[PDB]
Amino acid sequence: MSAVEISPDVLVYKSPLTEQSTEYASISNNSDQTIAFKVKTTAPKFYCVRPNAAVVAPGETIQVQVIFLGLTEEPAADFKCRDKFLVITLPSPYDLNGKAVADVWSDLEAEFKQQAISKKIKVKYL
Ligand SMILES: O=C(O)CN(CCN(CC(=O)O)CC(=O)O)CC(=O)O
C-alpha cells in the first residue's frame, strides 16, 4: 500500500570504464509515512553506495550516489555486466533514538519483510 518509487531500472556507466564515474538512483516516498531503505551491492569491490541505508520522509526524495571505481582494463564490447543493486524499502514508524538505519535494519526487516517493496537495479556498460 506504500507509494514508494525506486528508479532507475538500469544504471549505465559509460566508457572509459577504467575511470571512476558516478551514476545516481532515487527513492521517493509519496506515502504519508516515513520509510527506510537499504541498498545491497552484488559487487562491493567495484562500487561505493552513498547512502547505503537511510530514512525518507513523506514527500521526500533521496538520491543515492552509485560510484563505480573503475576496472583495471577496458572490457569487451560484447561483455555483459552482471552486477546488480537490490533496493529494499520498509516502513520506519519507530524513532531511531539516535541509532543508524543499518543498526535497526535487522529488526525492521524481521518485522516488515512481508511488506517490503523491493527493486533490482541492473548495470550495463557502455
Ligand atoms: O539519468 C538521467 O536523467 C541523467 N543521465 C542521462 C544521460 N545518460 C544516459 C544514461 O543514463 O544512460 C548518459 C549519457 O547518455 O550521456 C546522465 C547520467 O547518466 O549521469
UniProtKB/Swiss-Prot annotation:
Domain MSP: 3-126
Chief localisation class: endoplasmic reticulum
Residues the record lists as N-acetylserine modifications: S2
Location within or outside the cell: Endoplasmic reticulum membrane; Nucleus membrane
A molecular-function term among this protein's GO annotations: FFAT motif binding
One GO CC term, this protein: nuclear membrane
Resulting phenotype, K84D: Disrupts binding to FFAT motif
Residues with Phosphoserine modification: S106
Mutagenesis or variant effect for K120N: Reduces binding to FFAT motif and impairs OPI1 function
Membrane topology per record: Single-pass type IV membrane protein
GO biological process: endoplasmic reticulum inheritance; endoplasmic reticulum membrane organization; endoplasmic reticulum polarization; endoplasmic reticulum-plasma membrane tethering; negative regulation of protein import into nucleus; phospholipid biosynthetic process; regulation of intracellular lipid transport; regulation of phosphatidylinositol dephosphorylation
Domain of life of the organism encoding this protein: Eukaryota
UniProt keywords, alphabetically: Acetylation, Endoplasmic reticulum, Membrane, Nucleus, Phosphoprotein, Transmembrane, Transmembrane helix
Domain free text: The MSP domain is required for binding to the FFAT motif of target proteins.
Record function comment: Acts as an endoplasmic reticulum (ER) membrane anchor for cytoplasmic proteins via binding to the FFAT motif of targeted proteins. Regulates phospholipid biosynthesis by modulating the subcellular localization of the transcriptional repressor OPI1. Also contributes to the tethering of the ER to the plasma membrane.
Subunit description: Interacts with OPI1. Also interacts with PBI1. Interacts with EPO1.
More details: Present with 3497 molecules/cell in log phase SD medium.
Family under the similarity heading: Belongs to the VAMP-associated protein (VAP) (TC 9.B.17) family.
Protein name (record): Vesicle-associated membrane protein-associated protein SCS2
Species: Saccharomyces cerevisiae (strain ATCC 204508 / S288c)
Shown chain mapped onto the complete sequence: 1 to 126 of 244
